[PDB]
Structures are given as structure tokens and as C-alpha cells.
Amino acid sequence: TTIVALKYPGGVVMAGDRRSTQGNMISGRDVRKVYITDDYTATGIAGTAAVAVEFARLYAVELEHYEKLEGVPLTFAGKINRLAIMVRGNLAAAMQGLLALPLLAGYDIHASDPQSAGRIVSFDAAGGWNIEEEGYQAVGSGSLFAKSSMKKLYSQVTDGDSGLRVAVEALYDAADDDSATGGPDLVRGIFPTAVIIDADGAVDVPESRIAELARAIIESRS
Amino acid sequence: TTIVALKYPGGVVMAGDRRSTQGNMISGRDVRKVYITDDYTATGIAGTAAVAVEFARLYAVELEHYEKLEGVPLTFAGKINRLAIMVRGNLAAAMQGLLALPLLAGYDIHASDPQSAGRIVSFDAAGGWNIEEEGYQAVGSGSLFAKSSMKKLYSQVTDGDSGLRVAVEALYDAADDDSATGGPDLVRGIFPTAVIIDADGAVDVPESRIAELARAIIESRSG
Amino acid sequence: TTIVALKYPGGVVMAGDRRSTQGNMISGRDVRKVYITDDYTATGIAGTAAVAVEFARLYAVELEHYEKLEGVPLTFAGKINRLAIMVRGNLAAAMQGLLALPLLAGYDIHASDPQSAGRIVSFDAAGGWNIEEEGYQAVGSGSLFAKSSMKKLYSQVTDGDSGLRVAVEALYDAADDDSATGGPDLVRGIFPTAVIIDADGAVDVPESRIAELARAIIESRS
Amino acid sequence: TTIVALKYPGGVVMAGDRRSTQGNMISGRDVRKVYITDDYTATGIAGTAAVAVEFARLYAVELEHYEKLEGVPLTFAGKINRLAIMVRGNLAAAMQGLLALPLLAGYDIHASDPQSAGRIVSFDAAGGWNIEEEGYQAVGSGSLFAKSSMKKLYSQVTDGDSGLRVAVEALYDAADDDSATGGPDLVRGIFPTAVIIDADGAVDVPESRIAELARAIIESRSG
Amino acid sequence: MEQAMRERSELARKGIARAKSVVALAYAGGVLFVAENPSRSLQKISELYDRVGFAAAGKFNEFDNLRRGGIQFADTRGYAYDRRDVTGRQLANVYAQTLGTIFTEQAKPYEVELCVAEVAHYGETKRPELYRITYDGSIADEPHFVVMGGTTEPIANALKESYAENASLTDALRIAVAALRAGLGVASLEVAVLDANRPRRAFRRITGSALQALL
Amino acid sequence: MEQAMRERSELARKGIARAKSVVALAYAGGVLFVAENPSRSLQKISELYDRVGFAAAGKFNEFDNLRRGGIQFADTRGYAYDRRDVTGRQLANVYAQTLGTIFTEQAKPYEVELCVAEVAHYGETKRPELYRITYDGSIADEPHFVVMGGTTEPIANALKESYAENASLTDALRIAVAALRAGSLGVASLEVAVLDANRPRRAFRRITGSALQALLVD
Amino acid sequence: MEQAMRERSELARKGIARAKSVVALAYAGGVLFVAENPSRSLQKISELYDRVGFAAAGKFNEFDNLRRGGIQFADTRGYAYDRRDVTGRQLANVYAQTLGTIFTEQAKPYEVELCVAEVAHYGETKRPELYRITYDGSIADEPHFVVMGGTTEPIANALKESYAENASLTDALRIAVAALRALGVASLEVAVLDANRPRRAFRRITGSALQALLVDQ
Amino acid sequence: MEQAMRERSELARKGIARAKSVVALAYAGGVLFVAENPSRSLQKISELYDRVGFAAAGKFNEFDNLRRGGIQFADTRGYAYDRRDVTGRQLANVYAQTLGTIFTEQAKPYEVELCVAEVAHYGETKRPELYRITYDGSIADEPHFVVMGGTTEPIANALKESYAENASLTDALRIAVAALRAGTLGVASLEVAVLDANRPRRAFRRITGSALQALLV
Ligand SMILES: CCN(CC)C(=O)C[C@H](NC(=O)/C=C/c1ccccc1)C(=O)N[C@@H](Cc1ccc(F)cc1)C(=O)NCc1cccc2ccccc12
Ligand SMILES: CCN(CC)C(=O)C[C@H](NC(=O)/C=C/c1ccccc1)C(=O)N[C@@H](Cc1ccc(F)cc1)C(=O)NCc1cccc2ccccc12
């Protein structure tokens, strides 16, 4: 698995690959690892599929539950803390192999500077979290390839669409070096999924735009 | 064990073999592994016999329980979730050898397009599930043989009868390459079981039809 | 131990051996492993003696209990279910050596066809059960010898009397090839026990008739 | 330890040796292992002494408790069941070394035939029981020597005293071949204890009768 | 006490007397439930198990608790034993027990009256059973019809004079609606049947166009 | 305190008085139970254990609870000890205890009157035992017959005048049906069962339908 | 018994009669909730689930406890099964059960009257459902409107003459406020279940926008 | 409080007075229990422990519960310590504590009166002991006889005018049956048992049938 997230002027973008494995065998090609969990928040998870999907589903319910109970949504710090508490709660099972780590990307409606309101948070298996001040982050078995790729590409990130390109290219590199991360499948028409979040909220990036970016990267490397 | 499920235009089909083993010894020839669990859903389970039948039984009861309590059946997503929670609840026992994995095949009466209303959901030992968007799936010790056969035969699936034939042929292949999967017994007259599900509901395929498809396959491979 | 059960036209028959061992030592010669648990069902158990007899006793109580509570007996499927639940509840204890597996034989008063109303159900240590459609089944350390003998003799079963002899001969073969199954002791006059069940209920087969059958088989082999 | 019990025409006899050991060391010479547990039953126990005596005492309390609560004594099947349940109840502790097995001897007042009313029941560490239908049984580290002796001497049992003599002789043979079973000590004047049970109830055999029989056996084996 | 139980009884009886009426009657094809129910979506008639149906009169929240409790009971008993083992007499008996406990121990007694009905399993020949359980757990076994709620005496007399066994579905519904009048189009009736000709699950509602087709 | 028990007593006494009547009497082959019961399928008479039977008058849900508890008690005792150790005296004793605590501690007293009956075991010569237990736990040992529910005095007097211990099933059944009539009637309105001391193991057997008709007339 | 119950019934009924009124009515775009509420931050109309809304009249702490309990019930069910399995009828039923229990077993009855409303899911054609649950667990199914709190019969009859199906948002809004007088943004709480929102149908209409909608033609 | 206690007292007393009578008296061989008891199989007199007996008057289910609690107490104490440590006065004291608790805290007081009696051990010379425990836990130590249940004053006085210490079994039985008559009685209407000091361990023995009548003439 690889999930990537990065900040751009005015928002944040998150993308994830589509491969699922059982050992060496490919058991899924269309898997969805990036969810809009809230009007301003997306979570991508790497790890055991069952635990990953339970994390996303229960997280989204918890946020809206709070919103409907109290008439106001959680502050971004509160969202971070509830995710951290959930992960920490899974530590016992994770030590027995049911391990899943999330990556959180959001837009803080209350941030002072709308251009810096992008937020990226990484988590470890004990619930420790880091707000990434350097603009990008990744999680999963290809995360280091994606992080080292974005290290070199991030200077090209000037808007949401260039951020989207860099995200897809970093996933391409991860897939190139990690057999557990799946690249673009041009035979079946399957590409990474992406969510983009700006002041207007979180929206799913259409497949066709990711397809064009993927094909441009491919042909550019031939 | 091998259970196969596949989508065809307007419905879904699920079929399973009839063998039960204890190590290398054959302990059963007439075993049932595919149950109609709901008017529009069937589940087939692979694994420890006691747990597999417990899942099938309790799952069908849970579906009817909700339907009678609330006056309407669960959405297909709800059905998926409850099977998943049951599987995840068995995880502790599965780690000690009482493991069973189900495969869910259904017809969603609420889908927009009735021709794509078939659904196939596969599960792992922790409750993770995948809705299979490539039309077929299998579970059990012969699942890779059956899956790889369906990879080559799936394009011949155009209706229910062709779908059923591909299902029975994939189980034939699983039995050919897996000793824990039983093939058609033409001496005793025992053949795989199948359920076919379309807009009119889920029905058991008669043994007779499966016998005819089996004899056709056998003859196709002898000459 | 070996317990056998087979269907004959109009009923079912169950027979079991009499041996009790502690390792290599013979610790019992007259033991009884086949119990009439209900007016239409018999159960034979293999395994740890204390557990085996506890199974028969409590099962018979559970069936009768249901009957007096509800005014009607359980359907045969319900009888299977309660035996399975009992066996399953014992799994934890069975994994540390208190293992006992039963064989259930009955006559289903609600079946449509009176001649095929005999039922034989086998069980595993986890409660999995199988209704045997092939006419016979066995449990215990000699069960595979007895099943392989009945495989060859079953075509001779035409009535209760031929079925009873085939059953006793299958126990004879099991005793012949397994030292934990006792054969007929003609010195002490101890023979297998048998129960036969038809539309008129379950009755103990009298000792003399089994003795005749045994002496006939022995002589038949000399 | 060796405990013997045998049936004779009209009753039952049970006798036990008097030795107590800690490994190879003799820690007791006058110990008692055969208890009258009710007007018609005796229990002899082998194993860890603490557990053995606790078994005898608590069992006798349970039989009288039932008798006084319900106005009538338990049937012999009920007495057997309660002892079996107690034994099973000790299974965990026996698994950690506090193991004790009883041998039950009784006279069933409700039996049709007064001459066959003797009962002898053996138990295993899990509570399994066997009503011994060949007339004799033994428990303890010398049980097999005593059993094999009684196999050869049992045809001599025709009344209560011949049965007592055979029993004492079986304990003698056990002591001969088992170092944890004590023989007659003619220096200290210590002999096996015996209980005899007939239609008139269970009575302790006086020490003098066992001494006489014991010396007869010794004198017969020396010439 | 005597007057504690006397006013608990009167509170219940007057509650039921104020509620709309329900009829269940046996006909040639099984059992027919017809209830006065203005609601579009709140049901007084329900499936309990394969061949077992339920109908109720009185306070909705209370008999809905009873309906769910019966479904929980039936499904649990079928799971534990077998589906066949669950019977109408069984549910009726549990309702007698439950309403008895409710009637004596709850803060307020349930203002409810219940009917449990059973038809044959498919292809079997067994006369239908109707059971009526009242607010104190009294239970009565009735051979032809059951009336619950409202002013029952008139409806019972109307049924005593118009009821014939083995009637057709339309004749039975006609008679049922008539007796209910003695106390009504599609928009005011809830109708369902336990259909003995159905293979497994007998309960079936008759709604809308299908319903008015039969009046 | 005194008044509360007085009212519980009168509530239960009137409840039982409003109820239909039940008779149990000993005859040559064991014990006969006859109850006025319109119901096809709801039972006032039940098996408790091998040689032990139950009959009750009053509110159905309540005496059915007591019936289920008695079945539970007997089956547990037989399991713990032996089947032989279960007696009718024991069950009656537990019913006295149970109805006593019900009568004092429950929200409403139970409006029931019970009869526990026992016959000899197969091949034993022991006269039947009948025990009556009332709503407050009072227990009485009766030698010939027990009447419960409704207006008991007419029925009891008819039984005093007409009763024979060594009667046949047919004669005892008609003596009983007569006495029941005397206090206010065939197949469709009666529930009949016997503890048959000649049956080898389970003594309880119902008499239903055609067989019962054959016993009521000729 | 009987008098305990009539005293409880009259305490609750008088409590509701002293409270400010709430109307909910179906209009072309879904369901409209209009409540008399001078407060600024204490609300009597709330979202329960994606397409399910809640309005209440009576004592605040009491119907706020019921509101939170309903939200807990819905989120719990949607998590256990699926979101699409949570329905307005379900919540109305749980409220009926809950208010029956409260009404008979708690120290004081709740002086509340509730409305649970449901609109169609996106792209579906399903008529809105309105449910009224009263202080004793009585539940009613309604097709056009629900009136709760205060003096009901003036407002209910005013709506009985003025109501028309499939009215526009502005028309329904002024029909509702008119019936309520039988009032501006600082004195009203307004919200809608908008069947044309893709996921969460509940929307408040507040401040500048609400006055806009009140005045516009 | 005085309301409650007076009502409990008289409920219990009236209960005991309507019941059949029981006498226990010391005689040459131990203690003799004679009770008016029509029943074939239900008992008012029971063994408690080796040398300790029990008799009761009143409601059968209540004094049977107490009888079982006493058998339980004795068997437990003898198991914990030794059989010889269980005494008549211990059982009497626990009956006092138990009936006192019951009398004040149970829903209805027990309508029972109890007698706990003890004789010497085999071969020992000790006076028999009789203790009488009443419905409220009051406990009385009596030297010659105890009367319980029904109209106890006629019977008590008959014993006073007829009792002699160490009477023989036959004589003591006559005095007991006579005093019972004062407050027609043969084997079929009596339950008789003895604590027989001459028995080596369990002293309790019933006297029934042929033997009781033989004693009776
Ligand atoms: C969707 C279900 N499915 C169809 C049958 C699978 O095959 C999933 C696969 N389950 C397993 O590999 C089983 C793990 C297990 C084994 C024994 C006991 C208990 C649990 C998986 O999680 N794979 C992981 C990698 C992995 C494998 C084993 C392990 F222990 C830990 C991690 C993955 O690809 N994970 C990537 C992933 C991320 C987010 C959402 C997803 C959703 C669906 C599928 C994959 C998703
Ligand atoms: C029907 C019961 N039966 C009658 C004697 C069997 O022999 C079945 C066999 N039991 C066993 O192998 C014993 C399991 C066990 C052993 C020790 C402790 C606890 C449990 C089995 O499950 N086999 C499995 C494979 C297996 C075996 C052992 C193991 F540890 C794990 C898996 C199988 O064939 N499973 C196939 C199967 C799938 C769906 C429905 C079925 C229904 C009936 C029979 C088979 C079914």
C-alpha cells in the first residue's frame, strides 16, 4: 500500500493506490483506501483491510455524531485527538497482526491564513501523531519511495492540480519500487483514487483526470 | 473445498463441491456448502465444518430477524456488514483452528441497473470484505485453480445457463488439481450444488441440470 | 471402542463393543457404550468414559426435558442440534484429553417415507455433524475397519435381522484389527450391545440373539 | 497403597493396608484407608492422603445430609453418582498432584436377590465409574498384584469369612510385590483393616480375626 | 391489593375498549387478519415465524414491545432447536407468561390484547389455530375467529351469525369487514393472511390495488 | 401486615373459585386426571417425572410457570442423584415452599391450586399418593381423590358417595365426569390423562379423541 | 393507579400547553420545520440522520435528552448495519417506546411533544413522512403537517385551511408562520429537510438568509 | 413500628394456634417426640444431628425450610470442626437468630414454633436438653417437656399432673398421648419418634406401624 498527502496553496490533496495482497498473491485491484470522512477531512489507511475500513467508517461516524450532538463540528485538533485515541485503542490487536495506520489530511476552516489552512497528520501504531510542517507525507509499504520522490518534486507544487500530479507521480514511483503498491493499470482502466480539499470542502477527484496525469507520466518516462 | 460465484447479465450464480475431509481421509461425499440465506442471497463457506454451518444458519436467522422486526430487509450493504461482523467475531477461535471463510452472492433489488444487480463479496478471517467488480470469485483450497479457470472462461458468460456451466466447469478444474475438492461422482450420482439468483429471487439448481453440465464437461475433455 | 449404525428397510440398528482400556491394560469387559436416549433415538459414544457417559445421560435428560415442557418431542433436526451444541460446548475440555464423540441413530416419525425414515448422524469434536445418506457409519478407534467391512456387506441388508448381523460382523472385524475394540468373549459370555429402532420405537436387542449372530460369524470364519 | 474389595454370597468385603510413604521413606505404619461411609457402604481410597481422607469424610457427610434432608437414603445409583461427581470435581488438583481414587463397596437393600446385593464400583481421576461384575477389584500401587492374586483365589469365596481370608491374602501378595503397600507387621501387631457389609449393615472386622488369618497365610507360605 | 389489582384491571380494560378493533378468522386458505388502521406505516399485524402470525389491539408502543419480544423468542428457539419446533401454542404461552408478569409487576399494565395464529406447514393437513391473550395473561384457544379491541361484543355476534368455515378469501374478508362495521376502505384497513399454500413463509400482506380488488 | 395477607388470601381464593374444576383420583391401574378444559392444546395436566404427574386449577400462566419449575426441579434432581430418588413427596414439598414464597413476596399472589400424584414403579405394590398444594403453600396428603377449582363441595360429595379405589379406568372416568357435572360434557370439553402403573418406565399417558369417546360411552 | 396516571397526564399536558409552538409541514422540496424560539443558541429543531429530522415542544432539558438519545440510536444503527437502513419510522418507534417508559416509570413525566420527519434519498421519489409522538408514547402518522406545543387547535386549523401540497419553500414558510400567529428571525427557528441535497438533507435557515426568505416574493 | 410488630406477632400466634399440637418430653431412654399428624408421608419431627432432634408446629413449608437450614448448619459445623462439637444449644441459638431475623425482616413472619432436643452420647451420663424457640426468636430452656402448637394450655397442664422423670417408653408415650387428647388418637393420627440415648451414634429413630401400636396397648 501507499497513501500520499501534500499541501498546496489553498488546500491539500491525498491519493492512494488500488492493490490488495495476501502474501505475494494479488487479491484485489480496485480497492479504495482514501475516504472523505468529513466535509473538510479525508483519511487514508494502510494495513489490514478489515482494520483499515473499520477505522475509516467509525471515524466518520464519530465526527458527525459529535457535530449533530453539539451543533458544531470538532476543531481540527479534536479530530486529530479522536483518531489518535482510536488507533491507540487498536494497539493490542495490532501487536497480534491486525495493524493499520492512518494518514489524515484536512482543511482547517478556522486557520488564520486560508493559504496555509492545509493540514497533514501522520500516526504511529500507538496513537502518536505528527502534524507535518514540511508539506507532504506518506504511509504504507511504499511510503519511503513516495516520500523520497515528493522530496524532489514538491517544489513544482503551486496549485491543486500540480499537487495532484505530484501525488500521482509519487504513487507511480512507489509502485515502481514496491510490489505491494499497484501502479496504473492501463489494460483495465484502474488508477489511484484522490481527494482534494480546499475552502469549499472535500471532493473526489474524477477518474479521467487521474488517468490523463498517469498517462502523461508514463509516456514521459518512455 | 471450493466455492465459486460469478455474475451474469441479470443475476448471479454460486456453486460448491460436496467433499468433506479429515486430513487425507474422505469423511463426506454429500456435504452441502452453499445455502440460500435470504430471498435474494446465498452464502457458501469454506473451512471447519461446524463453524461453516454455524455461520450459514445464524446469518440466515439474523437476516430474517431484522426483516421481521423492522418490516423491511436489510440493504445489501447491511447484509455485508453483518456477515463481516460475524466473521470478525470468530477471529479468536479461527486462530485456534476453527476457521471458516464465507463468500456472499446476492441480487440487489435496489440497484439502479437490474442487469448489473448481481453482487459478489469475498471475506477474510478478520472480516475484511471486497465487492468483486470483475465478475467472479472463489474461496477454499481450490480457489486459485477455480479462479484461474474462470479467468479464461468468463467471456463465455452471457446468460444464466452459460454462467452455470462456467461455474460447474471451474469447480471441475478445482477438483482436478485439488484433492480436498470433490469432482462429480458419476457412480453415486452426487454433483456440486448451485444456487442461481435473479430478480425473481434465489432458487436451488436441480441436481439433474448439474449432472448434465458435468457430463458435458467430461465428454468435452475426453474427445 | 467401535460403534456402528446402519439403516435397514423400516428401521435403523446400532451396536457397540464392551471393552474399556487404560493404556494397554484392559480395565473393563462388560461396559456399555450404546444408550437408548429417547423413544426413537439411540446414542453411542467413543472416547473418555466419564465424558461419554455424561453425554448420554445428559442428552437423554435434555430430550425428555423438552418433551415434558412443550408437550411434544423435538423434531429430529432439533435432536441433532442439541447433541451438536453439547459436543461443541465440550471442545475446550476435549482439547486437553476429555474427548468424546457420539454417533446418533434414530427413526424419524415425521418423515414422509416410512421405509427410509432411519437416520444416522456422525459428529466431530467441534460439533460438526453429517446425516449419513450412504446407509452406515461408525465411530471409535476401529470405525474405519468397521466401515470398510460394512462397505462390502451392506448389499446383504434386507430386513432387521440381516442388518443386525451385518452390524455385529462389522464390530467383529473392528475388534479383529484394533486391540482397543473387544470382540465377542465366548469364555465369559459377553457380547456387543445393540439397539434397534423402527416405527414401534427403540428396543434393546436381547443378548441371546447377538450371541447367536456372533457364534455364527466366528464359525463362519473357521 | 492397596485396597481390595470382593463380593461373597450375601455380602461384600473391603480391606486395606496400613502403610504411608513419602517417596521411599515410610512415614506411617498404622494408617487407615477403608472407611464405613454409611450403614450400607464402605469407601477405600488410594492416593494423596489429604485428599483421600477428605474424600471419605465429605462423602459420608453427603450421604447422611441427603438422608436427613429427604427422609430416605439415596439409591445406590445415586451414591455412585455423587462419588463420581466429587472425584471429577477434584480433577484440576489431581492434575497438579493431589490425586486420589476411591473404590466403593456397598450392599443394595433394594436389590431383588439378597445374595447378589453386594456392589463394587471403581473410579478414574475424571469420575468414570465401573460396576465390577466379576466379583473383585482393587486400587492402589499394588492393585494389579492383588487383582491377579484374587483371580486365582476367588473360586474359594463361599461365605463372609472365606472372602475375608482371600482379601487378606490378596493384600499380602500386593505387599510382597509392592514396596508402598505394607504387609502384616507381626513385631508391632499391625494388620490390614477390613469392613464387611451384609443385610445387617456394615461392620468393622475386629483386629483379632485379621491377625489370625494373616498368621495362617504366613505359616502357609513358609512351610 | 384487591383494589390495586381492580384498578390495574380497569385501566387496562378501558384502554382496550377505547382502541380500534382487530379480527382474525380462519378460512379455507389459512388465517386472515383484518384490522382498522388509518396509518400508512405503523403495523398492527406482523409475521412471527414461518407459519405463525401476530395481531394486536391497544396501545401501539406496548404491543410493539410484545411483537418484538415474540420475534426474539421465536427466532432464538428456532436457532437453538429447529424451525419446526417453534409453534403457535408456544408463542401464545410465552405471551400469557409475559403479559401476566407485566400485569402484576410493571408500573402501568399494558393496555393490549393479542392474537397468535398458526397455519399448517406446506402440504400438511392441520386445522388452523387461533389464540387470544388478554392484558392479564388470560389465554383462550378459539376455533373459528378472534376479536380484539374496541367494542367486541357486536363484532363477535356478527361473526357468530355470518361465519362459515372453509370460506373463500373474498367471502372471509367481506364477513370480517362487516363484523368490524358492527362496532372502511383501503385507506383505513390493514389486511394480511397466513397462506397455507405458500411453501415456507406464510405471512403475506394484501395492500393497495390488490386489496381493493377483493371488496 | 395482617390485612395484606388477608387480601392476598381472598384474591387467590376468588381466582380459584372462578376457575373450572379438576379431579384426580386413584384407581386400580394408577391415578386418573380429569379436567374441564375446552382447549384443544392448552394443558392443565402434565407429566412431571417417570411416575409423577401434575394437575392444576386457576390462572393458566401461573400454574404453567409452576409446572415448568417442577419439571426443572425433577430433571435436575434425577440428574444429580438418580432417577429413582425423585419422589412425588419431594415435588409436592418444593411446591409448598415455592407457593409459600410466592404468596408472601410476589407482587400478586398466584391464583392456583395444585395436585402432585405418584404411582408405584413397575412391579412394585404401593398405593398411589396424592398431594394437594394451595395458593399459600399449604400441603395436604389425601388418600383417595383431590378436587381443585371452581365449586369444590358438590364435586367432593359426589366423590365421597360414588368412589371406588379399585375401579377400572372406564368406571373411574365416569365417576369423575359425573362428579364434575355435579358442580355446575364429553370429548370436546375434557382433558384426560393417567399415571398408568403398568407402563414399564414413563407412566403418563393422555387419552384423546376417539379413545376417550370410547371410554365415556358405549 | 388510575389517579396517578391521570395526574401524570394532566401535568404533562399542562406543561406542553404552556410552551411555545412548533409546526412541521411537507412542501415540494422536502419537510419544513418552523418553531417559535427567541433563544439564540438553544435549539428545538435538530438533525437526526442523513434524511431524518427532529423537532420538539416543551421542556428543554427533557426533549434535548430525547434528541441526544435519538442521535445515538441512529448513529448506532447505521454503524451496525448501514446508513441507508436508518429510517424515520424506526426513530419514531423508538421515541414512542422511550416516552411510554418515561411516562409510566420515571419520577416525573416528560413535558414534551416530538416530531420525527423523513424525506426521500437523493434521486428517489418517495413522499415525505411526518410522525408525531406525544408525552405518553402515542404515535401518529401524518401526511401534511404536525403541530405541537401551546394552543394547538388554532394553529392546526389555520394550517388546515391554508395548506396545499407541494408548496414552494417561501409559500410554505409564510403559511407556517401565519398559522403560528393564529415574528421574525430574532424570534423564529427555521430549518429544512431538503430532498435535493445529495447526502445530508438538514439545513438551517438563519439570519440574513432567513429574513431574505421571509420577505421575498 | 409498634403497628408492624404487634401485627406480626399476632399473625404468627394465630397461625400457630390454628395448627395441630406437638409434645416432646424427656424419658428414661432419651427424648420422646409425639405429634398430632394425620399425614402418611409429611413430617413434623426430624433428625438434626447424631444426638440432636427437631420438632415443629405451624405452617409446614416454613418449619420445613427451618428444618433444612438446621440440617445444613449442623452438617457444615461438624465438617468444619468435628461432629462432637455440634451441640443442641448451638442449633437452638442459630434458630433463635434466624427466627428473629425472619420475624422482623421477612415479608410475612413465620408461623412456626420449634423444639430442638439433645440426649447423652452413647455410654455417657448427661441430662437430656430441650429448647423451645418461638416465632420471634425467643428461646426457652425446659427440663422435662415442651408443648407446641394449637391450644397448648390443656396439654401443658395434663403433663404437669402426669409427668414423672425417667418414665419408661411405654409410660411416657401414654402420658403424651393423653395430654394431646386433652387439647381417638391412634397410630394413623400420630407421628412418633425418639432420641434414643442407647444408640451408638445416630439416636433418632421413628416408631411406626406394628411397633407403635404394640407400644400403644
Ligand atoms: C478485502 C479482503 N480481502 C479479500 C479476501 C483480502 O484479501 C484482504 C487481506 N487480508 C489478509 O491478508 C488476511 C489477514 C489476516 C490473517 C489471519 C487472521 C486474520 C487476518 C489484506 O488485509 N491485505 C493487506 C496487506 C496485509 C496482509 C496481511 C496482514 F497481516 C496485514 C496486511 C492489504 O493489501 N491492505 C491494503 C488496504 C488498505 C485500505 C483498505 C483496503 C481495503 C481492501 C483491501 C485492502 C486495503
Ligand atoms: C461434518 C463433520 N464431520 C463428520 C465426522 C467431519 O469429518 C468434518 C471435518 N472435521 C474435522 O476435521 C475435525 C475438526 C476438529 C478437530 C479437532 C478439534 C476441533 C475440531 C471438517 O471440518 N473438515 C473440513 C476441513 C477441515 C478439517 C479440519 C480442520 F482443522 C480444518 C478444516 C471440511 O471438509 N470442510 C468443508 C465444508 C465446508 C462447508 C460446509 C461443510 C459441511 C459439512 C462438511 C464439510 C463442510
Ligand SMILES: CCN(CC)C(=O)C[C@H](NC(=O)/C=C/c1ccccc1)C(=O)N[C@@H](Cc1ccc(F)cc1)C(=O)NCc1cccc2ccccc12
Ligand atoms: C470406566 C472407568 N474406568 C475404570 C476405573 C476406566 O478404566 C476408564 C478409562 N479411563 C482412563 O484411562 C483415565 C482417564 C483420565 C486420565 C487422566 C486424567 C483424567 C482422566 C477410559 O476412559 N478408557 C477409554 C479410553 C481412553 C483412555 C484414556 C483416555 F485419556 C481417553 C480414552 C475407553 O475405554 N472408553 C470406552 C468407553 C466408551 C463409552 C462408555 C464407556 C463407559 C465405561 C468405560 C469405557 C467406555
Ligand SMILES: CCN(CC)C(=O)C[C@H](NC(=O)/C=C/c1ccccc1)C(=O)N[C@@H](Cc1ccc(F)cc1)C(=O)NCc1cccc2ccccc12
Ligand atoms: C498422613 C500425613 N502424612 C504425614 C506423616 C503423610 O506422610 C502422608 C503423605 N503426604 C505427602 O507425601 C505429602 C505430599 C505433598 C502434598 C502437597 C504438596 C506437595 C506434596 C502421603 O500422601 N502419602 C501417600 C503416597 C503419596 C506420596 C506422594 C504423593 F505426591 C502422593 C501420594 C500415601 O502413602 N497414601 C496412602 C494413604 C491412603 C489413604 C489414607 C491415608 C492416610 C494417611 C496416610 C496415608 C494414606
